């Protein structure tokens, strides 16, 4: 039995290797590795050109068996959660997700989002492009914490809705979203110009 | 004769943006959901440089050529697009006085597109998402919507960005026919989800 603490914080440039590995794990999970062409240089030079919440923004979820310290944006401060005693985590990839090998802090998941716009309300919102929790850390509430963190940020900033898309056959994801109070819209279809 | 120009919106264009969005809501029979205000547009659309976040292209028309340059251009690296259209009968525009930057000249705002950067994570590559595209009724079926949509795509190419995306209602067949004629793919598998 071990304790567990979590923290959600903003990603910074030094987190690019973790973000890259998380996106790669997502591609493997989606069975779309052949579409994975992301690079660390591309992530660094596209995700951090603007300030947090101005354009692309990433929240990272980290976990530790010990409390985090008390202390990238004036509009955000990290969230903390304490979890109940449970079996220790078995994480074969911890060495790829540790900012410091000697410290017991591991990146467990992320959400990538950016501002969208409700024109009929003249009000920004947020759109979530990706949400992913690594396999050893699932079914502990982390995905829900990540999604609701974006919603809490929206409320804080006076923004409107949070939106995303799901595959209609993805009844598992639909279940995960329904339990969050999300509405699934049947009437819209995504259009694309290559 | 008729000349057209696509340029970036500035804060002085907020009244036109507000009235174009209102026309969209009237068109969709959704005026009960229109709560946008000029102050809200002015305080939210211009907090970043063009193309960094929310961006509006405005389509304007005139019977005379446009100036070679705009002194008030919000970006030194963007130049408006121009097109000359075939001589044709005059277009009746009962709303022209609501869409004229100055009564001095005949320049009228005929349409817009509102967009912002989106992201393809598997490619680590931004794209653009179009939130609004609208051509006022007097100016439709003359190629102006095609110009506005392809201007966003041309801007994406210029910036090394990826695809342009938007959403459409499943039953909005007229818009779908336009998008398909433009070469867009209507994806069947994705559904929008929302939290308010």
SS3 for chain A, per residue?
CEEEEEEEEECCHHHHHHHHHHHHHHHHHHCCHHHCCCCHHHHHHHHCCCCCCCCCEEEEEEEECCCCCCCCCCCCCCEEEEEEEECCCCCCCHHHCCCCCCCCCEEEEEEEEEEEEEHHHCEEEEEEEEEEECHHHCCCCHHHHHHHHHHHHHHHHCCCCEEEEEECCCHHHHHHHHCCCCEECCCEEEEEEC
Look up residue B194 and give its DSSP letter.
Answer: E
Q: A173 lies in a domain?
A: yes
Which helix (H) or strand (E) element contains residue B5?
strand B2-8
Distance CA B174, CA B98 (A): 26
Breaks, C-N > 2.5 A, in chain A lie after: 71
Using a CB-CB cut-off of 8 Å, the residues of chain B touching A16 are none
Which helix (H) or strand (E) element contains residue B76?
none
Two tokens at A73? 């944006």
Cα-only R_g, chain A = 17
Q: Which of A131, A193, A133, A12 is closest to B127 using CA atoms?
A: A193
Structure resolution, Å: 1.5
Q: B191 lies in a domain?
A: no
- Give bridge partners of residue B113 from the DSSP assignment: B57, B133
Residue whose entry in the numeric block shows the structure tokens 């401060």:
A77
Q: Phi and psi (nearest 5°) for B191? A: -130, 140
- Give bridge partners of residue B58 from the DSSP assignment: B7, B112
A130 touches chain B (CB under 8 A): yes
* Burial of B179 from C-beta contacts in 10 A (0-12 / 13-18 / 19+): buried
Q: Phi and psi (nearest 5°) for A4? A: -150, 135
Q: To the nearest whole angstrom, how far is the Cα of B70 from the nearest Cα of chain A?
A: 27
The CATH number covering residue A110 comes to 3.40.630.30
Q: Which of B73, B83, B96 is closest to B12 using CA atoms?
A: B73
Q: How many CB atoms lie within 10 A of CB A45?
A: 13
Q: To the nearest whole angstrom, how far is the Cα of A68 from the nearest Cα of chain B?
A: 29
B188 touches chain A (CB under 8 A): yes
- Give bridge partners of residue B135 from the DSSP assignment: B111
Q: A183 lies in a domain?
A: no
Q: How many CB atoms lie within 10 A of CB B150?
A: 17
Task: Determine, for residues A184 and B166 on separate chains, whether the beta-carbon distance falls below 8 Å.
Answer: no
**Long-range pairs for B96-104: beta carbons < 8 A, 24 or more residues apart:** B98/B16, B98/B19, B99/B16, B99/B19, B99/B136, B101/B12, B101/B13, B101/B16, B101/B60
Q: A193 lies in a domain?
A: no
Q: Which of A90, A118, A92, A74 is closest to B36 using CA atoms?
A: A118
Task: Determine, for residues A121 and B40 on separate chains, whether the beta-carbon distance falls below 8 Å.
Answer: yes
Two tokens at A174? 């639909």
Task: Determine, for residues A117 and B54 on separate chains, whether the beta-carbon distance falls below 8 Å.
Answer: yes
Q: Which of A39, A10, A17 is closest to A153 using CA atoms?
A: A10
Which helix (H) or strand (E) element contains residue B190?
strand B190-195
Contact B108, B99 (CB under 8 A): yes
Which residues between 46 and 85 in chain B have a beta carbon less than 8 angstroms from any beta carbon of chain A? Answer: 47-48, 52-54
Count: domains in chain A: 1
Distance CA B77, CA A17 (A): 32
Return all residues near B116 (Cβ < 8 A) that are at least 6 apart: A114, A115, A116, A117, B53, B54, B55, B128, B129, B131
Q: Phi and psi (nearest 5°) for B163? A: -70, 165
Report angle CA B40, A156, A131 to the nearest 5 degrees: 105
Q: B69 lies in a domain?
A: yes
Using a CB-CB cut-off of 8 Å, the residues of chain A touching B132 are 119
B125 touches chain A (CB under 8 A): yes
Task: Determine, for residues B182 and A193 on separate chains, whether the beta-carbon distance falls below 8 Å.
Answer: yes
Distance CA A64, CA A67 (A): 7
Two tokens at A99? 């900012």
Q: B192 lies in a domain?
A: no
Q: B72 lies in a domain?
A: yes
Task: For B32-189, list the strands marked E by DSSP.
Answer: 55-62, 81-85, 108-120, 125-135, 164-169, 185-186
Q: A11 lies in a domain?
A: yes
Contact A138, A171 (CB under 8 A): no
Which residue range is the domain that position A60 belongs to?
2-178
Using a CB-CB cut-off of 8 Å, the residues of chain B touching A189 are 167-170, 186-188, 190
3-state DSSP assignment of residue B142: coil
Using a CB-CB cut-off of 8 Å, the residues of chain B touching A47 are 124
């Amino acid at each position: 039995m071990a304790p567990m603490f979590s923290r959600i914080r903003l990603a910074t440039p030094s987190d690019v290797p973790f973000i890259h590995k998380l996106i790669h794990q997502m591609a493997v999970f989606e069975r779309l590795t052949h579409l994975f062409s992301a690079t660390e240089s591309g992530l660094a030079s596209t995700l951090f050109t603007s300030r947090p919440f101005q354009s692309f923004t990433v929240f990272l979820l980290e976990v530790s068996r010990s409390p985090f310290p008390a202390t990238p944006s004036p509009d955000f401060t990290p969230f903390f959660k304490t979890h109940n005693l449970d079996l220790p985590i078995d994480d074969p990839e911890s060495y790829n997700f540790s900012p410091d090998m000697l410290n017991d802090v591991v990146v467990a998941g992320f959400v990538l989002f950016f501002p969208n716009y409700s024109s009929f309300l003249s009000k920004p919102g947020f759109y979530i492009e990706d949400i992913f929790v690594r396999e050893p850390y699932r079914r502990k509430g982390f995905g829900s914490m990540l999604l609701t963190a974006v919603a809490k940020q929206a409320v804080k900033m006076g923004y409107g809705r949070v939106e995303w898309v799901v595959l209609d056959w993805n009844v598992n994801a639909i279940k995960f979203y329904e339990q969050m109070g999300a509405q699934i819209l049947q009437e819209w279809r995504v259009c694309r110009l290559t």
